[PDB]
């Protein structure tokens, strides 16, 4: 064996502080800890961050691509050209082997 | 469902026993032992418990049932199960 301290009992934060938020034993620190978590966590990051994300300018140009495609289809159909050609690159700029 | 009372439970426990042809309704009392006083056997006591279950709509397990030996014991058992305190 040895000289050892016994296992301490369980402290229920509610006994000393029935209004405890579970952050700190000091009631004033416990209130402030709750306030920063809620204000900075919910009011700022989650509410403003959600608003910021909703109004992101054309994330990855998906809207421009849709506007551009409209421009091309309008042009090509009017001029009788295919909407889309099978060849991505102009075949005159390619030199096949053999 | 209407609540039960100790007086109400006793009335119906006796009521059922007064409709059993093997008991004498005048000689019956809450404290009558089914064998020592009323002279029934154990096969009869199983039937009495069976009839009490049918009367109140719940089952008394055989381990508990074999000990209920007078009408007052049945009244006490039912009251305890149904949380009847008056």
């Amino acid at each position: 064996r040895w000289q050892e301290d016994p296992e301490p009992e369980d402290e229920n934060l509610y006994e000393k502080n029935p209004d405890s938020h579970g952050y700190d034993k000091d009631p004033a620190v416990d209130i402030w800890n709750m306030r920063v978590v809620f204000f900075f966590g919910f009011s700022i990051v989650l509410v403003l961050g959600s608003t910021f994300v909703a109004y992101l300018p054309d994330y990855r140009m998906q809207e421009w691509a849709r506007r551009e495609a409209e421009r091309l289809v309008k042009y090509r159909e009017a001029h009788g050209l295919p909407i889309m050609e099978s060849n991505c690159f102009d075949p005159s700029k390619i030199q096949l082997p053999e | 469902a209407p609540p039960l009372t100790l007086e109400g439970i006793k009335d119906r426990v006796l009521y059922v026993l007064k409709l059993y042809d093997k008991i004498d309704p005048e000689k019956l009392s809450v404290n009558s032992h089914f064998m020592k006083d009323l002279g029934l056997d154990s096969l009869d006591q199983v039937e009495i418990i069976m009839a009490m279950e049918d009367e109140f709509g719940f089952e008394i397990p055989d381990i508990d049932a074999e000990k209920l030996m007078c009408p007052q014991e049945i009244v006490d058992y039912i009251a305890d199960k149904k949380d009847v305190y008056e």
């Binding site: 579970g22 952050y23 620190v29 800890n33 709750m34 966590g41 989650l46 910021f52 140009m61 | -």
Partner: protein
């Protein structure tokens, strides 16, 4: 990235110079402010990634992982400050320093433009992670868990170091932008078979790949709650993120080298899902749940399709928040009853009605209830593996069934039934515990309204 690296370092002076009773308030508040500013990384373009300097860049793959990493630091602080209350003050500040330094290595790891800078930071995360597990774990086995975590990783990483340096010699660069243009195909040969293995085994161990996963249930069961949160949410995703980048230079050899690892993942996911049905330890159940989910990510990365890469990116983010939530939920029970035995404390919905709501929401995301991003990620992967081979829907279907069985079994066993009579210290849920749970589920459910920002570069 210096607008994030520097304020992350400044969290260390802040913690050490804070009043003795304000270390948690100050570190939590200012780490939330850093999380707020990380949203500026979502200035992404359709064609070009966001390249800041010769050292750091941020595309659509690393941006959501960075935001997940910086969001997790405040959550880890909230989750730890209860069980560290009796800790010595200096040893509380050293604990927080280990978490801050982990965030620092992590945000630099996800934005390193050069792969050998990625390797060093990727490896650097081991030290703070190992110290957290072995110093602040509770059981005897935390020491063995540290060794398994350390040596499983290093067994794979050291071959990766040789392969990357060999790649720099032959190609002349390891800059990821340069690799996109200078990549040459890999032709069959035993020499390239082992170059492929060296490049992928380090990441397979981190995911982990089924068979190589034994370190993970050990580490989770022994780590403190904050360690388990970062382990599941982010550190597993270092394997996925690394694989999504390195596979660029492994083509077309990935066509046939993938087969043994797809087989392990497709079958492994059913095996680890079924293990969850018979786990007796709640944390171990959640650990094995991660293996099953990360099996899908491995398959998706290896079949190399636009839909599979989108699905893998969403799965990594969705799993990060859900698995972190589940560990936090199980921890709140543990802080009361001080055991991880799942069957010990039952019928808790009677005693903690609101915490039972969190248990429900966490389970629903874990089984991928639509339209959660858990379902978006898992569905996109299943669509792409079906085109890879139709028969995979059989294995995908079964896993979905077994995943629901163990998710609701965990809910039913702990929350429903009758409460355990002799357990009488189930105190009402603290505000800290409820706010911790909501800071997991609310952002996870909010991302359903706008899922494109977690779908990765191929969106």
């Amino acid at each position: 990235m210096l607008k994030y690296i520097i304020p992350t370092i400044m969290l260390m002076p802040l913690t050490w110079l804070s009043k003795n009773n304000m270390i948690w308030v100050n570190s939590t508040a200012h780490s939330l402010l850093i999380s707020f500013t990380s949203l500026l990384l979502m200035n992404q373009f359709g064609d070009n990634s966001l390249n800041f300097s010769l050292l750091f860049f941020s595309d659509s793959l690393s941006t959501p992982l960075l935001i997940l990493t910086m969001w997790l630091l405040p959550l880890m602080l909230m989750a730890s400050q209860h069980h560290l209350s009796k800790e010595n003050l200096t040893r509380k500040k050293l604990f927080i320093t280990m978490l801050i330094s982990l965030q620092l290595f992590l945000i630099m790891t996800f934005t390193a433009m050069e792969l050998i800078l990625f390797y060093i930071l990727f490896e650097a995360t081991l030290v703070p992670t190992l110290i957290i597990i072995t110093r602040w774990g509770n059981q005897t086995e935390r020491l063995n868990a540290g060794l398994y975590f350390l040596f499983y990783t290093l067994a794979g990483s050291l071959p990766l170091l040789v392969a990357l340096i060999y790649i720099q010699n032959t190609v002349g660069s390891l800059n990821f932008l340069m690799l996109q243009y200078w990549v040459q195909p890999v032709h069959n040969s035993w020499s390239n078979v082992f170059m492929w293995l060296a490049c992928m085994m380090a990441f397979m161990v981190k995911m982990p790949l089924y068979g190589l996963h034994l370190w993970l249930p050990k580490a989770h069961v022994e780590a403190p709650i904050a360690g388990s949160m970062v382990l599941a949410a982010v550190l597993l995703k270092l394997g996925g993120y690394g694989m999504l980048r390195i596979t660029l230079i492994l083509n077309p050899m990935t066509d046939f080298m993938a087969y043994p690892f797809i087989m392990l993942s497709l079958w492994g996911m059913i095996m680890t899902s079924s293990i969850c049905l018979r786990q007796t330890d709640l944390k171990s159940l959640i650990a094995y749940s991660s293996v099953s989910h990360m099996a899908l990510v491995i398959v998706a990365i290896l079949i190399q399709t636009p839909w599979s890469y989108m699905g893998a990116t969403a799965l990594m983010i969705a799993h990060g928040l859900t698995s972190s939530m589940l560990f936090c939920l199980a921890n709140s029970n543990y802080e009361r009853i001080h055991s991880r035995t799942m069957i010990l404390a039952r019928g808790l919905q009677t005693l903690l009605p609101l915490m039972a709501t969190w248990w429900l929401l966490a389970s629903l995301t874990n089984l991928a209830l639509p339209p959660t991003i858990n379902l978006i990620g898992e569905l996109f992967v299943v669509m792409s593996t079906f085109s890879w081979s139709n028969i995979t829907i059989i294995l995908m279907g079964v896993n979905m069934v077994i995943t629901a069985l163990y998710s609701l079994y965990m809910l039913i066993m702990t929350q429903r039934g009758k409460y355990t009579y002799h357990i009488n210290n189930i105190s009402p849920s603290f505000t800290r515990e409820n706010a911790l749970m909501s800071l997991h589920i609310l952002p996870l459910l909010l991302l359903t309204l706008n899922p494109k920002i977690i779908l990765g570069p191929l969106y």
